[PDB]
UniProtKB/Swiss-Prot annotation, chain B:
It is found in: Mitochondrion inner membrane. The chain crosses the membrane at residues 55-74. This is NADH dehydrogenase [ubiquinone] 1 subunit C2. It is a single-pass membrane protein. One of its GO terms (biological process) is mitochondrial respiratory chain complex I assembly. GO terms for cellular component: mitochondrial inner membrane; mitochondrion; respiratory chain complex I. Disulfide bonds: none annotated. Belongs to the complex I NDUFC2 subunit family. Complex I is composed of 45 different subunits. Interacts with TMEM242. The gene is NDUFC2.
UniProtKB/Swiss-Prot annotation, chain F:
GO terms for cellular component: mitochondrial inner membrane; respiratory chain complex I. Core subunit of respiratory chain NADH dehydrogenase (Complex I) which is composed of 45 different subunits. Interacts with TMEM186. Interacts with TMEM242. It catalyses: a ubiquinone + NADH + 5 H(+)(in) = a ubiquinol + NAD(+) + 4 H(+)(out). One of its GO terms (biological process) is mitochondrial electron transport, NADH to ubiquinone. The keyword Magnesium does not apply. Core subunit of the mitochondrial membrane respiratory chain NADH dehydrogenase (Complex I) which catalyzes electron transfer from NADH through the respiratory chain, using ubiquinone as an electron acceptor. Essential for the catalytic activity of complex I. Keywords: Electron transport, Formylation, Membrane, Mitochondrion, Mitochondrion inner membrane, NAD, Respiratory chain, Translocase, Transmembrane, Transmembrane helix, Transport, Ubiquinone. Gene3D superfamilies: NADH:ubiquinone/plastoquinone oxidoreductase, chain 3 (1.20.58.1610). Its main location: mitochondrion. It is found in: Mitochondrion inner membrane. InterPro entries: NADH_UbQ/plastoQ_OxRdtase_su3 (IPR000440), NDAH_ubi_oxred_su3_sf (IPR038430). This is NADH-ubiquinone oxidoreductase chain 3. Signal peptide: none annotated. It comes from Bos taurus.
Swiss-Prot record, chain G:
One of its GO terms (molecular function) is NADH dehydrogenase (ubiquinone) activity. The chain crosses the membrane at residues 1-20, 24-44, 46-66, 87-107, 148-168. Its EC number is 7.1.1.2. Belongs to the complex I subunit 6 family. Keywords: Electron transport, Membrane, Mitochondrion, Mitochondrion inner membrane, NAD, Respiratory chain, Translocase, Transmembrane, Transmembrane helix, Transport, Ubiquinone. It catalyses: a ubiquinone + NADH + 5 H(+)(in) = a ubiquinol + NAD(+) + 4 H(+)(out). Its main location: mitochondrion. Core subunit of the mitochondrial membrane respiratory chain NADH dehydrogenase (Complex I) which catalyzes electron transfer from NADH through the respiratory chain, using ubiquinone as an electron acceptor. Essential for the catalytic activity and assembly of complex I. This is NADH-ubiquinone oxidoreductase chain 6. It comes from Bos taurus.
Swiss-Prot record, chain J:
The chain holds residues 75 to 100 of 144 of the full protein. Accessory subunit of the mitochondrial membrane respiratory chain NADH dehydrogenase (Complex I), that is believed not to be involved in catalysis. Complex I functions in the transfer of electrons from NADH to the respiratory chain. The immediate electron acceptor for the enzyme is believed to be ubiquinone. Involved in the interferon/all-trans-retinoic acid (IFN/RA) induced cell death. This apoptotic activity is inhibited by interaction with viral IRF1. Prevents the transactivation of STAT3 target genes. This is NADH dehydrogenase [ubiquinone] 1 alpha subcomplex subunit 13. It is found in: Mitochondrion inner membrane; Nucleus. The gene is NDUFA13. Belongs to the complex I NDUFA13 subunit family. Complex I is composed of 45 different subunits. Interacts with CARD15, but not with CARD4. Interacts with STAT3, but not with STAT1, STAT2 and STAT5A. Interacts with OLFM4. Signal peptide: none annotated.
Amino acid sequence: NPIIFIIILLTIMLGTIIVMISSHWLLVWIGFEMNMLAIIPIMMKNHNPRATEASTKYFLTQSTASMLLMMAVIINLMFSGQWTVMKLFNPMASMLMTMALAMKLGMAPFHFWVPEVTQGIPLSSGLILLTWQKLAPMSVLYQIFPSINLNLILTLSVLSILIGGWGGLNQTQLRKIMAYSSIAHMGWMTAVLPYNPTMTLLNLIIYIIMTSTMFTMFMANSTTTTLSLSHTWNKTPIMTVLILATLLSMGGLPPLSGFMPKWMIIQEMTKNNSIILPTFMAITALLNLYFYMRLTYSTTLTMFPSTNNMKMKWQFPLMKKMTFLPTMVVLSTMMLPLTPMLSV
Amino acid sequence: XXXXXXXXXXXXXXXXXXXXXXXXXXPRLAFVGFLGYCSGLIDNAIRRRPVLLAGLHRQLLYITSFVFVGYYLLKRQDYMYAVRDHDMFSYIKSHXXXXXXXXXXXXXXXXXXX
Amino acid sequence: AERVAAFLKNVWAKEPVLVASFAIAGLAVILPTLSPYTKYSLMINXXXXXXXXXXXXXXXXXXXXXXXXXXXXXXXXXXX
Amino acid sequence: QKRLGVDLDRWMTIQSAEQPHKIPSRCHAFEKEWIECAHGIGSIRAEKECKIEFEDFRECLLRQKTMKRLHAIRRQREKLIKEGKYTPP
Amino acid sequence: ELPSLEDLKVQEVKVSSSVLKAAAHHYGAQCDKPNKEFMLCRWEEKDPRRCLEEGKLVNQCALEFFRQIKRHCAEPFTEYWTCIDYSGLQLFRRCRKQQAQFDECVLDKXXXXXXXXXXXXXXXXXXXXXXXXXXXXXXXXXXXXXXXXXXXXXXXXXXXXXXX
Amino acid sequence: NLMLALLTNFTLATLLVIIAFWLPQLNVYSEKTSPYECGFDPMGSARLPFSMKFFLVAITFLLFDLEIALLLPLPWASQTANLNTMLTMALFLIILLAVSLAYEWTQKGLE
Amino acid sequence: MLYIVFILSVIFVMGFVGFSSKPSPIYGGLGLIVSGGVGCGIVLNFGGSFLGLMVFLIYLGGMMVVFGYTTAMATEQYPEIWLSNKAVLGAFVTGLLMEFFMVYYVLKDKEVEVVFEFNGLGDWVIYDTGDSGFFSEEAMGIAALYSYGTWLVIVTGWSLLIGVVVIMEIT
Amino acid sequence: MINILMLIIPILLAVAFLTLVERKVLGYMQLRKGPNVVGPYGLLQPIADAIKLFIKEPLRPATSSASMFILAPIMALGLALTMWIPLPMPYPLINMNLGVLFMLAMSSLAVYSILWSGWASNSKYALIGALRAVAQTISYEVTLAIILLSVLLMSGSFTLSTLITTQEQMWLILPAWPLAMMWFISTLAETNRAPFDLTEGESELVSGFNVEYAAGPFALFFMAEYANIIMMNIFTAILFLGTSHNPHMPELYTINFTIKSLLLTMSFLWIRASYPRFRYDQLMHLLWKNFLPLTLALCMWHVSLPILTSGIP
Amino acid sequence: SMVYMNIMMAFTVSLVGLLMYRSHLMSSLLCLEGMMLSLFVMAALTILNSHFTLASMMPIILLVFAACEAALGLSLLVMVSNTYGTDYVQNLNLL
Amino acid sequence: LQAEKDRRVLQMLRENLEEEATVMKDXXXXXXXXXXXXXXXXXXXXXXXXXXXXXXXXXXXXXXXXXXX
């Protein structure tokens, strides 16, 4: 808790570095396992009956997934021989490869663990870990974008926004809304991988900054919609404006930075001549907007959440990047069109 | 281009192609500087402090850091767009047969009524 | 003495096996760096051939002769 | 790699490298050809010029081209029973 | 594939028994010129079909080596040979006492040399045979190299994006 | 042969069981009991978890056994490779194992 | 009689059926000894005694830790035999049809496979390795090394430090 | 093959004739007369037990288990008697590609005999003697491999044939002075007749792998448990003792090797009579807490030594 | 080729074993070490046949990490029984 | 090392005579150019191809780790 907690947090940072700086297929496998040993201790922390359920659920629905990844690594010895992270060569190898990564990024048939895991974390700082862990397998897919069968990656893009756009509608838990907002945004990620690998890294930069701000806005304890409802009428009134700005950006709207994903994804897809697929991407994106729309009604409406208790003392939270990152999350449109080139 | 062919992998600056001249007091730099000033307004709303504009003088750190990172970010922007144009123009001259020119023609087209 | 001689005898009194765990393992790191004999062991390790010798084409070369006993290249003579 | 290593190297990943002691690979003859063909960027991205050398590399590790050939010889020897038999060994 | 002739190289090839060859390390010192040239041929050109002619001279000199020992000082050679086969594979251990009877008889003839330490890999070429350096297995260079041009880009007027 | 050496010992061992199985037979009454050793009726019928007490010390073995397996190169690997480059790496695995056991001293467990 | 590895590979899958068809971690525990120990013979016959016997050192020792939770935690209620339960035996009887029916096609001609590759006979081709190396022989003969893969030594040392500290936080 | 059959039948007799020594030497240690009535010096009594326990004794457990239980005495002998095969001796039966790896693997596999005897009785009374037998063996498997590695790096490789040739002038007891003292304790990892020992003897708790078993399976357990004691005594006489080799005369080696082992054979029964049991908790504190940092410090020491002064096979 | 097809068939049964859950949670942790056992045999045969020597170090690293996840999952099994009574896949609260 | 290549050449000539004897009438087998499309390096690989018949000789040559005499 005092010293070793910093070391455990550093090993996730170091674990991703092994994935980032790699040439060997067994080296990234180590990097994925470095995350397995380092997230689960922070998943527990306080030790709860809810935390025990989520930690085992996060373990079993990811460690078995990495074991499928090692099969694809071994097929790279069976076929094509060389241990190099460039191409899979075999179509049989790519099928077990993509579905292993789909347990972390694709989501469309592997979303099931996400809502239970995100709600199971007792800490607000622990919620950052899930949104940051998705950086690791994206760097793998950025390397092996050829050879992979596009018919079974684009299904993990179309269907994921459908279940992501429906799965958050019947959820009041604030952690659960953010769990399916993850699935909704990960649907776009798997769509750019066949159509121009650049901007896909910038898609993460927009996503991570926008989500890291979101959970740090919930440093004042909130777990449900009705608990986040009592924020302007009882606590700080100017804080809800920044929550409003982040939620309006999470759904694709032009005067905010959250339209810059929707800008280039459709732009690069149309260059490869595809009309019927990106039309369905835009209509299903409206279903994503609905969750944030209901959650902006905790900042705009009256709703009567006053309660008996009233806070007078000034709040002193951690707030790592709660001032620099929301400014880039709100008003990045004019200083944005040239930025696709800067990422890669 | 997504993958490097002429430039060496893993580099912060260009270095190999430095001759381009960076922008001096650009209209783009003023907006990033405004964003650095905007972050120094909203931090006094989170941590409840008197006056958004006439508050603490820790705002100068927020203005400088956005300009400093932004200047290197804009340097990468002007470089990558130049390499994109450099590779495109070289591709046409090397092939020659891929590009064809047609100019000055009078051809009939159907006109709409009403 | 504050911790050199004063604290050392406290380890001998309670749990005396802890003294040997630090002293013997500690000397195992210091000795291979300072002692003038460690470089000799690497010399014989490189000299002992695992694979068969390879023949190279000779065209104006120094310190190269036939397989017969003659002064060529270097040849190990370090201690008998 | 999304970010590459500079100065310090942690390679020894690809086939046919600097050997552990001196012992060479079993497929080292076909391994040398694949590096020589795909050293340029416009070879594996094209995946048409190195098609001949990749098919020869497939023969080395899997032995599938030799497996179907040796299967035909062993079947014909089993099929010819009590009619036309030869045994020099 | 084109295989070798049915007549084969070297008439009456190889010694009758093993360990006998391992007992004598003097084969490294005497008759090395035919051995090393075959070795130089085989590493440069990996095909056994090309350097079989030099391999014929190796086996021919091998018969010449053993016939010299069988004529002069045969009895100390046989006693040393029975000693090495009585034990497992010590090679030089325990049989050092009987090794004193050997070599000393061989020293009377000029055909005797001690290994002392190591061969250290010697390089010598005195046959060449069509030079033979460039052959390998490669047939195609595959479009030589990709087209690359360096001229340094100026600035490029206007960004490619919609808003500029 | 290794296969013929292992099977002949195994077949002779199982054959001795058959000798002690079929020769002594006269009567088998409802006489044999579940717990034995001390007597009386078993208060703890069938199976019950029990567990705990050694749960931390047993887990650490599964973690440590992998490292000792990674220490097995030491007498067999140090023959061809350079010793000075190996010295920094060979000790490195042994040093960190003492660090993990140093963290095991601060509250070892219930055992 | 010509086959050495192929007969052992039948026993390898035989123990693996007692995992999908759940026989409790005692009868299912036996699989890691029966199919695991025979699984070493698959490695041993191809070559390299080190890596072949390395499976024996951990998958029996680590199984004792698993055994430390068979008589503990959860499973201590009923033994649950794979010959008694109707839901379990149904998975085993279909499990053996995935193995024994496949061997029926191996005898005479090439065997039918779900994968594109044909199995054929391969008795002498089962080894598929020439003598080549003599002194310091086998690729597995000098397998484990600290040199060349110096980066791999550090991270393995790190991962075995993390776990000890991490499990302490969980418990 | 005749050698394997000439290494089970005379070896089972050595485990049979052990029963004499188990109460003759142990008897005189306690000042009491052991075997006397049956034979000239009770020599007919060890062979009488084979007629006693197998032909006439019939038990099979009550509630029992299915195929397992009777599988365990097959696992007891068929994994502990196989240990005689990789032994270097004057000449080994099929000399292994790596010697001690097979010795360490099959010894840990021999522990399963007391493990499967826990599920011999479905009742909870027997498995307490099994759960105690887990920890009294699981911890000591750590050092058993580490102390080996310090000796193996000092002399030769894993091959047991090289371990005879390395001791030509002096024994390995003198260079490995604290490590030799460890192999009087670490050898008692398996359930052996000792003071350190494991959950097998009575004294405080019920007899492990004996309360569930009969006479016939229970008799087969002793033919395996006491067999491991000789096995560790021979294995110590290879790693730490040697004296001479002599490949020409096997007669001079066979007499000299047996005396060295027999002095160690008495030494474990010397330990058994002298000292009480170390307790379940406190045996886990002898090693791990106290002895594991000592062995690793000596393991650190034995890594540097071949680099300090040339010592590579 | 021939030997690979049998150990690939053993992988598919253990694949189902990780996806099948009945009563106890202990079956998964056996199958986690089971699937790693099948991958280890597959790695051993591929590297040794077409000799590598350098890359024969890789499965030894893989075997270390094979039980790295297995030790952590087995320690998580301990804390579930402390919160509940017996570890059950049938007994869960979260939605 | 020459003794290895002396045996491998003799095994190849025995295989050439067996292929011509078995295939004569209906089946199409040329044996020329061989399996490899390179036909410049020509690897020996005499382990799967070496000894087409006789079980007693083939079993001893293939196994070296097994039995180990």
